[PDB]
Amino acid sequence: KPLVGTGMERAVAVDSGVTAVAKRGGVVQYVDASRIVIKVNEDEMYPGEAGIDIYNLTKYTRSNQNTCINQMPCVSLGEPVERGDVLADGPSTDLGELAL
Amino acid sequence: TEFLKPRLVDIEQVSSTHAKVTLEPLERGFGHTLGNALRRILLSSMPGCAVTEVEIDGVLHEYSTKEGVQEDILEILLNLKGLAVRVQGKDEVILTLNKSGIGPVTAADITHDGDVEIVKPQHVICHLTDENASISMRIKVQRGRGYVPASTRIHSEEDERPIGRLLVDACYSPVERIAYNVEAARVEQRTDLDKLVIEMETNGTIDPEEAIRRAATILAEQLEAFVDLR
Amino acid sequence: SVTEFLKPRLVDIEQVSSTHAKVTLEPLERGFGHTLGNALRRILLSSMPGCAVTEVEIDGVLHEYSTKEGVQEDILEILLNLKGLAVRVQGKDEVILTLNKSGIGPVTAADITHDGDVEIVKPQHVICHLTDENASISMRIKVQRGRGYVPASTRRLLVDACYSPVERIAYNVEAARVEQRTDLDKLVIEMETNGTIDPEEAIRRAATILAEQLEAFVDL
Amino acid sequence: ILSPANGEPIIVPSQDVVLGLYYMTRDCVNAKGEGMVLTGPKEAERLYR
Amino acid sequence: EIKELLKLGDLPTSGQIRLYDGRTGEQFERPVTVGYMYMLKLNHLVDDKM
């Protein structure tokens, strides 16, 4: 992260596509180095067979300038997350902050 | 003329890491000379021990992700760069590691090889997050003197490898920072004598007494090359 | 192979004058140029044993800002000439010398009375000039053992004292090569003494001083 | 050394050397060792070190 | 406000610290400015040009 930054890097790092954002709020149920499985809160379940969510993070692969796009988890196991919050730090991000 | 010689007084240690060592008798000018000379020699070249090669069961190449493990393999290598290991009688030791269960794999979980001891047993490596998770690796700790990157050793081998090895560049320097001061010494009927205070922070591997004696041994060898001039 | 290092295999001692010298050393470990250069530089400046002149008194004048007839120089000029008077002294600690001459011409260094063990190294050093045959100069000067360089402000006329027999040292660190290693230091000492000693011996005396400083830590 | 467009040296010392030489050769009316006396330039160097 | 935040820590107000020298061990005479600046690395790498 940068020490001296304007109050803007969170909206830039979220509103782009390089990070993964939880669509519904709930409890972290499984985190590997590759993927994140989230149990959904029961208030946010439409009543027909909602269940869980699965995010498959993108691993080491090619970008157009031959740099290495990467994703990593930033939540711990059994931790609560909320709708609209970050889960996967992409490239040059840090906890939902743009960090070049 | 008829000048004094230093001695070695009061090795205080504030913590496990950092000490300050005091040299009580000094002449007028020699405080800064010995302070800067020992600061340079201790920062540059000391015997250290660090991790060179890592082999993990079930990982072909680095840039992969073992299942169950929270970090990548790359972050496990960047964690094992920072491992404080004192080797007492050898030059290369193959430590092992085996762990299962949910929890952090801590460096205390290394199978105790005996003569090798671990300075800091609270250092984290990875975090296993599953019942059916099991990390099992073989770590190579080697003794060296400077700073050697990966590719120099890569083209120094040139002959063969198996695939599962990962090379990790070493960091053979046990000290981290050194600051010295020169203060007014107190020897009877005399006011123009000085005193060194050397404050050094290491990684916990090496005793400060041995450090100062070995630095003075190196400087003595260089000036023994000087004295016999032509 | 941890403990051993590269020890130097030197090239030359190129000397220009009988008191000018240049010494080269190669190769040294990467970063051992400046430690040895700084150590020898700071020892040869700040602390050497040497004999120099501390005080002078003129029989005619007992004040600094004054004058005397017959002298094309001044009292200030003749004190600056008496700083650079280079003398070696045998086992005494300090001793007075007297100077006395009448006549016209350059009063030089060999004019001074011999006084036994006291030996002047430069008998052609020009002290003052007398222009009148009636004018005659006579003075008292004190040589004294000392340990470096002392200004007059921390100090019968007070003279600056230059005990240290060096006059110039400057060191350089430049690239040198062992065929597979990339960068090793190469050290160049350049040095001027005053003439009380040849320049080669001053280096080995300073190195002897620093090894005897480390004597209480070499022991393993 | 001289330029073909006009007879002026093209080896003018640039910005950083200018700052160094300008900082060396100045004066200030009260400092260490003011008003003493010297033998050569090399004794002035030995006083600076 | 930068002055007061530097006053909350034990740092000097002027933003200038005495700095020593690695080679000689002497002192740099005037105080210099030290701080933490955030820097980038651009992709004009030398092993795409030589």
Residues C161 and C54: beta-carbon distance below 8 Å: yes
Residue B38 DSSP one-character state:
H
In Å, how far is D37's CA from the nearest CA of chain C? 8
**Distance (Å, whole) CA B8 – CA B216:** 12
Which residues 61-100 of A are in CB contact (within 8 Å) with B? 72-73, 77
Say how many residues make up chain C. Answer: 220
Residues B54 and B73: beta-carbon distance below 8 Å: no
Residues A53 and A81: beta-carbon distance below 8 Å: no
**Distance (Å, whole) CA C89 – CA C52:** 9
**Residue that the structure tokens 């060096």 belong to:** C166
| Resolution given for this structure, in angstroms | 3.7
| The two structure tokens encoding residue C167 | 């006059």
User: Which of B89, B19, B83 is closest to B52 using CA atoms?
Assistant: B83
Q: Please state, as a whole number, how many other Cβ atoms lie within 10 Å of the Cβ of residue B63.
A: 13
CATH code, C50-163:
2.170.120.12
Residues B47 and C2: beta-carbon distance below 8 Å: yes
Residues with Cβ within 8 Å of C148's Cβ and at least 6 positions away in sequence, in order, are: B29, C46, C47, C48, C163, C164
The rounded Cα B145 to chain-centroid distance in angstroms is: 9
Peptide bond into B25 cis (omega under 30): no
Burial readout B157-181 (b: 16 or more C-beta within 10 A, e: otherwise): eeeeeeeeebbbbbbbbbbeebebe
| The two structure tokens encoding residue C143 | 């040589």
Architecture of the structural domain at B48-172:
Beta Complex (2.170)
| The two structure tokens encoding residue C138 | 């006579």
Residues with Cβ within 8 Å of B125's Cβ and at least 6 positions away in sequence, in order, are: B76, B79, B80, B104, B105, B106, B107
- Helix (H, G, I), strand (E, B), or coil: what is residue D35? coil
**Distance (Å, whole) CA C139 – CA B25:** 42
Q: Is C116 part of the contact surface with chain B (CB cutoff 8 Å)?
A: no
| The two structure tokens encoding residue D21 | 């030489």
Q: Extract long-range pairs of A73-76: CB within 8 Å, 24+ residues apart.
A: A73/A31, A73/A33, A73/A36, A73/B70, A75/A28, A75/A31, A75/A36, A76/A28, A76/A31
| The two structure tokens encoding residue E26 | 């002497």
Q: Is E20 part of the contact surface with chain B (CB cutoff 8 Å)?
A: no
- Helix (H, G, I), strand (E, B), or coil: what is residue C204? helix
User: Which of C94, C48, C65 is closest to C209 using CA atoms?
Assistant: C48
Q: Is B47's CB within 8 Å of C2's CB? A: yes
Q: Where are the alpha helices (DSSP H) in chain C?
A: 33-46, 75-83, 199-218
List the beta strands (DSSP E) in A5-99.
20-21, 26-31, 35-40, 52-56, 61-62, 68-69, 72-73, 80-81, 86-89
- Helix (H, G, I), strand (E, B), or coil: what is residue B104? strand
Q: Is E25's CB within 8 Å of C34's CB? A: no
Using a CB-CB cut-off of 8 Å, the residues of chain A touching E40 are 100
Q: Which amino acid is at E14?
A: S
Phi–psi pair at A50, nearest 5 degrees? -75, -65
Q: What strands lie across the sheet with C20-28, from one edge to the other?
A: C13-14, C20-28, C184-193, C166-176
Residues with Cβ within 8 Å of C57's Cβ and at least 6 positions away in sequence, in order, are: C139, C140, C156, C157
Burial of B149: CB neighbours in 10 Å, binned 0-12, 13-18, 19+ = exposed
CATH code, C1-49+164-220:
3.30.1360.10
User: Which of B4, B3, B1, B2 is closest to B25 using CA atoms?
Assistant: B4
Q: Please state, as a whole number, how many other Cβ atoms lie within 10 Å of the Cβ of residue B80.
A: 21
The count of C-alpha atoms lying within 13 angstroms of the C-alpha of C212, restricted to the half-sphere facing its C-beta, is 12
| The two structure tokens encoding residue A74 | 């930033």
**Distance (Å, whole) CA D13 – CA D20:** 11
For residue A38, is it left (φ>0), alpha (ψ between -120 and 50) or beta? beta
Q: Which amino acid is at B195?
A: K
Q: Is A65's CB within 8 Å of E43's CB? A: yes
Residues with Cβ within 8 Å of C210's Cβ and at least 6 positions away in sequence, in order, are: B33, B219, B223, C39, C40, C43
Using a CB-CB cut-off of 8 Å, the residues of chain E touching A3 are 36, 38
**Distance (Å, whole) CA A46 – CA B15:** 58
Peptide bond into C27 cis (omega under 30): yes
In Å, how far is E30's CA from the nearest CA of chain A? 27
Residues B172 and B146: beta-carbon distance below 8 Å: yes
**Distance (Å, whole) CA E6 – CA B222:** 45
The rounded Cα B81 to chain-centroid distance in angstroms is: 11
Q: Where are the alpha helices (DSSP H) in chain E?
A: 2-8
**Residue that the structure tokens 């036994």 belong to:** C116
| The two structure tokens encoding residue B122 | 């609270």
Q: Could you state, in order of their start, the residue ranges of all structural domains in chain C?
A: 1-49+164-220, 50-163
- Helix (H, G, I), strand (E, B), or coil: what is residue A87? strand
**Distance (Å, whole) CA C57 – CA C96:** 11
CA distances from A59 to A28, B201, C58, C97, C133 (A): 20, 39, 92, 90, 103
Residues B95 and B136: beta-carbon distance below 8 Å: no
Which residues 119-138 of C are in CB contact (within 8 Å) with D? none
**Residue that the structure tokens 């090895």 belong to:** B165
Q: Which amino acid is at C195?
A: G
Q: Is B68 part of the contact surface with chain A (CB cutoff 8 Å)?
A: yes
H or E segment at C122?
Answer: none
Q: Is A3's CB within 8 Å of E36's CB? A: yes
| The two structure tokens encoding residue C97 | 């010398």
**Residue that the structure tokens 């050094």 belong to:** B200
User: Which of C51, C135, C53, C63 is closest to C100 using CA atoms?
Assistant: C135
In Å, how far is E30's CA from the nearest CA of chain C? 22
Say how many residues make up chain A. Answer: 100
Phi–psi pair at A11, nearest 5 degrees? -70, -35
Q: Which amino acid is at C44?
A: L
The rounded Cα B27 to chain-centroid distance in angstroms is: 33
Burial of E15: CB neighbours in 10 Å, binned 0-12, 13-18, 19+ = middle
Residue A34's CATH number: 2.40.50.100
Mutate which of E20, E23, E27 to test chain C, going by most C C-beta atoms within 10 A? E23
Q: Is A33's CB within 8 Å of B102's CB? A: no
H or E segment at C24?
Answer: strand C20-28
Residues B73 and B56: beta-carbon distance below 8 Å: yes
**Distance (Å, whole) CA B75 – CA B94:** 21
List the beta strands (DSSP E) in B27-156.
48-56, 85-86, 92-100, 103-106, 117-118, 124-128, 134-144
H or E segment at C135?
Answer: none
H or E segment at B176?
Answer: strand B175-184
State the fold for domain B1-47+173-230: Gyrase A; domain 2 (3.30.1360)
Residues with Cβ within 8 Å of C106's Cβ and at least 6 positions away in sequence, in order, are: C126, C127, C128, C129
**Distance (Å, whole) CA B207 – CA B16:** 10
